[PDB]
Amino acid sequence: SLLEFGKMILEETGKLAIPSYSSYGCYCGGCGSGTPKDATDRCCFVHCCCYGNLPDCNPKSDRYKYKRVNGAIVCEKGTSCENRICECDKAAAICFRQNLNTYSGKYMLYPDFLCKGELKC
Numbered sequence: 001s002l003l004e005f006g007k008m009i010l011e012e013t014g015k016l017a018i019p020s021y022s023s024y025g026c027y028c029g030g031c032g033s034g035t036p037k038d039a040t041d042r043c044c045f046v047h048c049c050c051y052g053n054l055p056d057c058n059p060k061s062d063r064y065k066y067k068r069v070n071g072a073i074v075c076e077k078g079t080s081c082e083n084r085i086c087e088c089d090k091a092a093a094i095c096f097r098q099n100l101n102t103y104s105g106k107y108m109l110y111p112d113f114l115c116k117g118e119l120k121c
Contacts, residue, residue, distance in 0.1 A: 001063045005089045008066070008073065012093040013100055021096070025107045026115035034115025040103050043095035049121035050088035057081035059088070066090070 006017035015021070022029030025041030027048055036042040051059045064082035066075050073093065075086035 002060045004063060005092070008089055008093045009096060011068070012097045023109045025110050032115070033117065035117035035119055037107055037110065038102055038104065039099040040096060041107065043092055043099060045119065046095065047088060047092040050091065052121055054081065054084055057085055059085045
């Protein structure tokens, strides 16, 4: 669920999802189109695509279980959808962490009209 995803993000980056990633670039929190602005925005694009591979799952509301094996994120066994949603979220959280060094405030609250493009999953 997006509540867990938010908690996973906070644990990984030290940043609150809802400021930091809910209105970043063209794909973070409310994604539609254009070319990802930077690495962090690309993490969100791939994340939107990952959810897209799961048409009959409900990522925003289905809760999965995960544990931290001192540092590592380990998705615990649930339904097929829960397992796959968890892997999508885990990847996004790791991607965010790997690209914290280029996170840029100038991309927060990025205007829709500047998202011009076509990028297929």
